[PDB]
Design a protein around this ligand. Structure first.
Ligand SMILES: [Mg+2]
Length: 302
């Protein structure tokens, strides 16, 4: 079920990568170079970036020439293993034991940042976690309102901004101070949503993590970057930017339901070394799924 969510999320990627099975029917030692040329094309087509594609393909070539892989089916399994190792190389939320844990959620418009926060709150509440929401998306009035609805839905308290021109850092500080005083397990912090990254946005995010750190030592525990999965490889420059400016601990890739760009998941993880912790594969609250690298590899290749 949970597992079969992901099978649908990447159904189109799986259909497209299936051409690899057909190609491998015609593999033999002599045909290795031509077969690998075609495998390379298929990976690129599904948004495996140039860097990982060459890495995967050349490792297969080596292992074929060395005699480690002696059949099409062995080659296909080595392909799956090579991808799994690029992925899994922790995807769970690392909240520790000190209370409160602090989670910031960041990302640009269209990525489902505020919505994912709501769905995460719903998930945490399910496991019996005491959650305070903090509406630090001060740029988007509609986000703050949406979050209040989410707070009502999930049964969380929410700290909201006073006014249309509140400082996010101020709202977050107030939230974490309160979470600490009132014995909350987790403070879930939203942050400002913009059309695209810019100097103001990053300055703002830096100010935010600095303020929460002032109140609780080590905060935030997690800074999760939410990305529209449909942007494929075009997400990498942006994730790279968030990471070197702010310091991201986990990715959430959304809107993935039905995608043909499954390769980008592997590409973004291996390039930046940040784990994908959740994937959004639907509009339902329970369509925010923790990421399972093995099931993903099976979903796109099998
Ligand atoms: Mg700094």
């Amino acid at each position: 079920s949970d597992v079969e969510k992901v099978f649908s999320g990447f159904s189109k990627t799986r259909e497209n990568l299936a051409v690899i099975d057909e190609l491998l029917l015609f593999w033999n030692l002599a045909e290795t170079d031509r077969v690998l040329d075609e495998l390379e094309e298929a990976l690129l087509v599904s948004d495996f970036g140039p860097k990982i594609t060459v890495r995967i393909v050349e490792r297969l070539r080596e292992d074929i020439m060395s005699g480690k892989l002696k059949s099409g089916s062995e080659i296909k399994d080595a392909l799956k293993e090579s991808v799994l190792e690029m992925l899994a190389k922790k995807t769970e939320l690392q909240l520790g034991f000190r209370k409160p844990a602090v989670i910031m959620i960041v990302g640009v418009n269209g990525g489902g940042k505020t919505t994912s926060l709501g769905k995460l709150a719903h998930r945490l509440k399910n496991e019996g976690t005491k959650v305070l929401m903090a509406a630090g998306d001060t740029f988007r009035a509609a986000a703050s309102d949406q979050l209040e609805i989410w707070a009502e839905r999930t049964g969380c308290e929410i700290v909201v901004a006073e006014g249309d021109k509140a400082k996010a850092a101020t709202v977050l500080s107030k939230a974490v101070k309160r979470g600490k005083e009132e014995g909350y397990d987790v403070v879930l912090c939203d942050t400002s949503g913009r059309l695209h990254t810019n100097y103001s946005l990053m300055e703002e995010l830096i100010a935010c993590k600095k303020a929460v750190g002032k109140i609780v030592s080590g905060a935030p525990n997690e800074i999760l970057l939410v990305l529209d999965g449909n942007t494929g490889l075009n997400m990498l420059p942006q994730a790279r930017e968030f990471n070197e400016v702010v310091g991201i601990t986990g990715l959430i890739l959304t809107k993935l339901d039905g995608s043909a760009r499954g390769g980008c998941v592997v590409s973004v993880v291996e390039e930046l070394g940040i784990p994908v912790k959740f994937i959004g594969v639907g509009e339902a609250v329970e369509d925010l799924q923790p990421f399972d690298p093995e099931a993903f590899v099976n979903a796109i290749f099998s």
